[PDB]
Design an enzyme around this catalytic site. Structure first.
Site, PDB file in Angstrom:
ATOM      1  N   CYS A 143     -11.305   2.722  -2.279  1.00  0.00           N
ATOM      2  CA  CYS A 143     -10.160   3.400  -1.690  1.00  0.00           C
ATOM      3  C   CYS A 143      -9.951   2.828  -0.290  1.00  0.00           C
ATOM      4  O   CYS A 143     -10.912   2.633   0.453  1.00  0.00           O
ATOM      5  CB  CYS A 143     -10.419   4.902  -1.606  1.00  0.00           C
ATOM      6  SG  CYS A 143      -9.069   5.827  -0.845  1.00  0.00           S
ATOM      7  N   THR A 144      -8.694   2.566   0.057  1.00  0.00           N
ATOM      8  CA  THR A 144      -8.334   2.008   1.362  1.00  0.00           C
ATOM      9  C   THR A 144      -8.912   2.756   2.553  1.00  0.00           C
ATOM     10  O   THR A 144      -9.274   2.153   3.559  1.00  0.00           O
ATOM     11  CB  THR A 144      -6.804   1.980   1.552  1.00  0.00           C
ATOM     12  OG1 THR A 144      -6.265   3.283   1.279  1.00  0.00           O
ATOM     13  CG2 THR A 144      -6.165   0.956   0.621  1.00  0.00           C
ATOM     14  N   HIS A 145      -8.999   4.074   2.432  1.00  0.00           N
ATOM     15  CA  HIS A 145      -9.487   4.923   3.515  1.00  0.00           C
ATOM     16  C   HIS A 145     -10.994   4.965   3.738  1.00  0.00           C
ATOM     17  O   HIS A 145     -11.454   5.138   4.868  1.00  0.00           O
ATOM     18  CB  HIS A 145      -9.000   6.358   3.284  1.00  0.00           C
ATOM     19  CG  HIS A 145      -7.510   6.508   3.319  1.00  0.00           C
ATOM     20  ND1 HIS A 145      -6.655   5.629   2.687  1.00  0.00           N
ATOM     21  CD2 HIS A 145      -6.725   7.448   3.900  1.00  0.00           C
ATOM     22  CE1 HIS A 145      -5.407   6.018   2.882  1.00  0.00           C
ATOM     23  NE2 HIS A 145      -5.422   7.118   3.615  1.00  0.00           N
TER      24      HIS A 145
ATOM     25  N   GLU B  55      -7.246  10.725   7.120  1.00  0.00           N
ATOM     26  CA  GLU B  55      -5.926  10.631   7.733  1.00  0.00           C
ATOM     27  C   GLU B  55      -5.812  11.574   8.927  1.00  0.00           C
ATOM     28  O   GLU B  55      -5.014  11.336   9.829  1.00  0.00           O
ATOM     29  CB  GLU B  55      -4.825  10.923   6.701  1.00  0.00           C
ATOM     30  CG  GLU B  55      -4.904  10.011   5.480  1.00  0.00           C
ATOM     31  CD  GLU B  55      -3.594   9.898   4.714  1.00  0.00           C
ATOM     32  OE1 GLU B  55      -2.906  10.931   4.555  1.00  0.00           O
ATOM     33  OE2 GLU B  55      -3.264   8.776   4.258  1.00  0.00           O
TER      34      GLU B  55
ATOM     35  N   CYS C 177      -3.710  -1.257  -2.098  1.00  0.00           N
ATOM     36  CA  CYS C 177      -4.027   0.058  -2.632  1.00  0.00           C
ATOM     37  C   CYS C 177      -4.925  -0.015  -3.867  1.00  0.00           C
ATOM     38  O   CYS C 177      -4.595  -0.684  -4.849  1.00  0.00           O
ATOM     39  CB  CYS C 177      -2.733   0.799  -2.977  1.00  0.00           C
ATOM     40  SG  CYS C 177      -3.010   2.491  -3.554  1.00  0.00           S
ATOM     41  N   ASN C 178      -6.062   0.679  -3.819  1.00  0.00           N
ATOM     42  CA  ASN C 178      -6.984   0.689  -4.953  1.00  0.00           C
ATOM     43  C   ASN C 178      -6.394   1.474  -6.117  1.00  0.00           C
ATOM     44  O   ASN C 178      -6.655   1.163  -7.289  1.00  0.00           O
ATOM     45  CB  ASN C 178      -8.324   1.319  -4.560  1.00  0.00           C
ATOM     46  CG  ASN C 178      -9.016   0.573  -3.439  1.00  0.00           C
ATOM     47  OD1 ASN C 178      -8.599   0.639  -2.285  1.00  0.00           O
ATOM     48  ND2 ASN C 178     -10.077  -0.156  -3.777  1.00  0.00           N
ATOM     49  N   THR C 179      -5.621   2.507  -5.789  1.00  0.00           N
ATOM     50  CA  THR C 179      -4.999   3.339  -6.813  1.00  0.00           C
ATOM     51  C   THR C 179      -3.922   2.568  -7.550  1.00  0.00           C
ATOM     52  O   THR C 179      -3.874   2.581  -8.779  1.00  0.00           O
ATOM     53  CB  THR C 179      -4.378   4.617  -6.208  1.00  0.00           C
ATOM     54  OG1 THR C 179      -5.419   5.455  -5.696  1.00  0.00           O
ATOM     55  CG2 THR C 179      -3.589   5.387  -7.266  1.00  0.00           C
TER      56      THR C 179
ATOM     57  N   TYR D 118      -0.833   8.366  -3.527  1.00  0.00           N
ATOM     58  CA  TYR D 118      -0.619   7.978  -4.910  1.00  0.00           C
ATOM     59  C   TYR D 118      -1.771   8.538  -5.755  1.00  0.00           C
ATOM     60  O   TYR D 118      -1.577   8.931  -6.901  1.00  0.00           O
ATOM     61  CB  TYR D 118      -0.655   6.455  -5.033  1.00  0.00           C
ATOM     62  CG  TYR D 118       0.600   5.705  -4.665  1.00  0.00           C
ATOM     63  CD1 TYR D 118       1.636   6.313  -3.950  1.00  0.00           C
ATOM     64  CD2 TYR D 118       0.743   4.364  -5.022  1.00  0.00           C
ATOM     65  CE1 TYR D 118       2.783   5.599  -3.604  1.00  0.00           C
ATOM     66  CE2 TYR D 118       1.884   3.638  -4.681  1.00  0.00           C
ATOM     67  CZ  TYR D 118       2.902   4.261  -3.972  1.00  0.00           C
ATOM     68  OH  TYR D 118       4.036   3.548  -3.648  1.00  0.00           O
ATOM     69  N   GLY D 119      -2.964   8.545  -5.165  1.00  0.00           N
ATOM     70  CA  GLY D 119      -4.176   8.983  -5.848  1.00  0.00           C
ATOM     71  C   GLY D 119      -4.238  10.363  -6.478  1.00  0.00           C
ATOM     72  O   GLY D 119      -5.106  10.629  -7.316  1.00  0.00           O
TER      73      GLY D 119
ATOM     74  N   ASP E 180       0.847  -1.187   0.000  1.00  0.00           N
ATOM     75  CA  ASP E 180       0.000   0.000   0.000  1.00  0.00           C
ATOM     76  C   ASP E 180       0.882   1.235   0.000  1.00  0.00           C
ATOM     77  O   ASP E 180       2.070   1.159   0.313  1.00  0.00           O
ATOM     78  CB  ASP E 180      -0.915   0.050   1.223  1.00  0.00           C
ATOM     79  CG  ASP E 180      -1.869   1.226   1.176  1.00  0.00           C
ATOM     80  OD1 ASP E 180      -2.573   1.370   0.154  1.00  0.00           O
ATOM     81  OD2 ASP E 180      -1.918   2.007   2.154  1.00  0.00           O
ATOM     82  N   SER E 181       0.297   2.377  -0.349  1.00  0.00           N
ATOM     83  CA  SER E 181       1.046   3.625  -0.376  1.00  0.00           C
ATOM     84  C   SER E 181       1.402   4.043   1.050  1.00  0.00           C
ATOM     85  O   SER E 181       2.296   4.865   1.267  1.00  0.00           O
ATOM     86  CB  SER E 181       0.226   4.723  -1.070  1.00  0.00           C
ATOM     87  OG  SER E 181      -1.052   4.880  -0.476  1.00  0.00           O
TER      88      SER E 181
END
Ligand code: 003
Ligand code: 003
Ligand code: DGL
Ligand code: DGL
Lengths: 255, 248
Positions: free
Chosen positions: B181-183, B150, B70-72, B39-40, B7-8
């Site tokens: 998205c991870t978040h 974040e 990471c989805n991005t 990254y997005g 992941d980023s």
């Protein structure tokens, strides 16, 4: 005179604009580490290495001075960069301290420092101000201002709500506000407006702009009389989104 | 099995949590390129290179399979990464498409894809969904969700105002929302609450979780605990987060 300007990305444009108007240099090599922006949410160790790697980028360009337009980099990597650099490196923190010293006589004037999480956490501003005799210093890490500004949210309810989120907890009537981040000048008026409309301030507080401040410093320190080339050569480089960066330069700096 | 999770940054925790709960792997090597996150917000050529470089990190670990949480990175770098990798690399996009196939029988069901600017512009989900027969696909780059999350803005006026800023302009009411998205899982109930509070709905939209979707795929495809953390940024901080949130 050929110099370099370093920033985490395009933010440094706010400092570059000031530099351009002041006709201090004939050639400028701008470098934004766009592939790794932002710096504001990261740690000292990581930032310092970024700063050192920036020096590597400029070596082929034979610059005679480097301006660290980034407030975060100025706060966390400047000392390390200066340690190994053969050319002078000027950050955007000390110039602002001197600017305040010159225009703020009342050592008890409430000063509010705004910046990234990294910049504020470093207390770079607080320490410098204390050393200069100031006794009323407050700081706030208005982190979200950065991405909002990057999405071009320079007005509207979202920005208003974000400013409200950060400013409401304040229990002081700031007389001086440091825009300790490359991005903040873009909402300076909005910030001034928030305090004038949400606080009982008799007059707008003094806003310290990092770019104007460094211009003042450079002119005095290096005895620069604002007589450099009228239409100076400026190059834009970056670790990423370079095509985009160049477009932004033409669109906003007319370069 | 010994696997890697990429992941980023710390965001991948949303996927790692699912993996851990499912008790699928004996050992996990988690790597967050926290020095360069996000990254997005960056261009595809930069993200793809980031992905290739991530592969190098795992080489000495001798992992048997790599999970791109990471989805991005899954949307932009997966194809290139798989090209230069001998071990299987599993992203979080295709697994979700499969879950949707199982949970959404109606091909006309309005599906809304949420993700970073990079993920949305790639049309990774839309293309995959189109290929599988879905006829009502929408997408939306809710970029500011990442930094809000974040900074732990998981409730309150600021999150509400931000969700409103992004959702108001929508004309189609989603029946299914992909948290691409991870978040986003951290504000899943808030996104749910938004549509349930702004429109008259007897049942909330179905939210698709990247972590749960990939667990199902892994168990399916691979007929499927030591965990170490590594980061390009502050690894001690990342490990502290793991201890606080994953109790690892
Ligand atoms: C030198 C600047 C005062 C010029 N300028 C604007 O005046 N104004 C008014 C700008 O809006 C502007 C913009 C801009 C372009 C697209 N989206 C948001 C901001 N940009 C590019 C940009 C991009 C991202 C972050 C930036 C942070 C600080 C300065 C510039 C930034 N530049 C803008
Ligand atoms: C997602 C869950 C496995 C754990 N979890 C929470 O449940 N919850 C509820 C969390 O809040 C959480 C947090 C958290 C810690 C500090 N500030 C914001 C979020 N963090 C660490 C974190 C940090 C930044 C971005 C993240 C994006 C996606 C997942 C986790 C992220 N983890 C949290
Ligand atoms: N250039 C940074 C803001 C953007 C970033 O965090 O990288 C500063 O002046 O603090
Ligand atoms: N990990 C990213 C979010 C953070 C980033 O942009 O790097 C994603 O899942 O899209």
């Amino acid at each position: 005179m050929k110099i370099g300007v370093f920033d985490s990305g395009v933010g440094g444009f706010s400092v570059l604009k000031s530099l351009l108007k002041a006709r201090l240099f004939d050639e400028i090599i701008y470098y934004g580490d766009s592939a790794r922006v932002p710096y504001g949410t990261k740690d000292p160790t990581t930032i310092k290495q970024f700063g050192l790697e920036a020096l590597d980028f400029f070596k082929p360009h034979e610059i005679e001075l480097l301006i660290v337009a980034c407030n975060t980099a100025s706060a966390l990597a400047l000392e390390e960069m200066q340690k190994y650099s053969k050319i002078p490196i000027v950050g955007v923190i000390e110039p602002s301290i001197l600017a305040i010293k010159r225009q703020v006589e009342d050592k008890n004037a409430p000063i509010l420092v705004l910046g990234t999480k990294a910049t504020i956490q470093s207390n770079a501003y607080d320490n410098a101000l204390k050393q200069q005799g100031y006794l009323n210093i407050s700081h706030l890490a208005t982190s979200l201002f950065v991405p909002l500004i990057e999405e071009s949210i320079l007005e509207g309810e979202l920005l208003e709500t974000c400013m409200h989120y950060y400013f409401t907890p304040l229990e002081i009537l700031p007389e001086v506000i440091i825009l300790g981040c490359t991005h903040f000048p873009l909402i300076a008026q909005k910030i001034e407006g928030y305090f004038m409309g949400h606080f009982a301030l008799p007059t707008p507080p003094l806003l310290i702009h990092s770019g104007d401040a460094i211009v003042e410093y450079l002119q005095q320190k290096y005895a620069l009389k604002n007589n450099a080339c009228t239409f100076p050569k400026v190059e834009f480089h970056a670790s990423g989104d370079v095509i985009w960066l160049e477009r932004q330069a033409k669109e906003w700096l007319k370069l």
